[PDB]
Structure 1
Amino acid sequence: ATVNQLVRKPRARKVAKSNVPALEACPQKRGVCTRVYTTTPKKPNSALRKVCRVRLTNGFEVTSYIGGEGHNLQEHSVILIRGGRVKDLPGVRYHTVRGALDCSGVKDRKQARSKYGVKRP
């Protein structure tokens, strides 16, 4: 553009929208796991799912996928959501770290162990 068109109105920046708007600059948050679901995905995939539904301490309620190979979550247990949106099923844009507050590390793991709450044998 002409230099005058920039002197009058400058170059506006591009605002950024965070992917996870409930963490509000926090790598972890505590939940309550108000409910547990097994809903179906959208894209062609071989599973139903393994998700949950926790209410963060700051009021927000967001879904949270549950990784691993079998969980032990109840309707009144606290979790620790971290992030890492999940592509397949829409609406889930979080995760659940294992072995932090009331979860447990899935069993028999011996590769990529630190990602779950599994100690060394």
Structure 2
Amino acid sequence: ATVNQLVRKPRARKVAKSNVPALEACPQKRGVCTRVYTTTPKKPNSALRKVCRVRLTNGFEVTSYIGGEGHNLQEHSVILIRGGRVKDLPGVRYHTVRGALDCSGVKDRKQARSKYGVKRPK
């Protein structure tokens, strides 16, 4: 309000925590699948999403979301996890990146093959 008040109490910031705590400011983290299954979204739209509870290397255990159709991953599978959450699924804050150590890419993919780790067709 006034300079006399502001010199006594400096204008503090409004720092907000990140939405990806388990990454610890890291683009990618390697984890091992623990519980691969299917869940249902919330009220606005009904579907059957594919999710996986995975224990990260540092110690955190999170729930990712498998992208695309077709995933050969299962329990005890090494996967790579990046940021980005799913709006219509509560709890998920990360995405499993395809083309990883064991996460195979989507079969017969022609468009946006890089986002799903698909070799360029001949």
> Could you say whether these structures have the same fold, taking a TM-score greater than 0.5 normalized by the shorter chain as the test?
yes
Rounded to whole Å, the distance in 1 between the matches of 2:31 and 2:10 is 44
Residues 57-109 of structure 1: per-residue CA shift (max 9 Å, x gap): 00000000000111011100011010111000100011011111101111111
Matching residue of 1:11: 11
Query: CA offset at residue 16 of structure 1?
Result: 1.8
- Unaligned 5+ runs, structure 1: none
- Unaligned 5+ runs, structure 2: none
Query: CA offset at residue 15 of structure 1?
Result: 1.1
Report the secondary structure of 1:4's partner residue.
Answer: helix
Report the secondary structure of 2:39's partner residue.
Answer: coil
Rounded to whole Å, the distance in 2 between the matches of 1:32 and 1:45 is 30
Rounded to whole Å, the distance in 1 between the matches of 2:9 and 2:46 is 53
**Residue 27 (structure 2) pairs with residue 27 (structure 1):** yes
Residues 30-57 of structure 1: per-residue CA shift (max 9 Å, x gap): 1111011211111322411111010000
State the percentage of identical aligned residues.
100
Greater alpha carbon shift after TM alignment, 38-47 vs 4-13: 38-47
Report the secondary structure of 2:33's partner residue.
Answer: coil
Rounded to whole Å, the distance in 2 between the matches of 1:21 and 1:43 is 27
Rounded to whole Å, the distance in 2 between the matches of 1:24 and 1:43 is 32
8 Å contact 1:84–1:94 — kept in the other structure?
yes
Q: Once superposed, what is the RMSD of the aligned Cα atoms?
A: 0.9
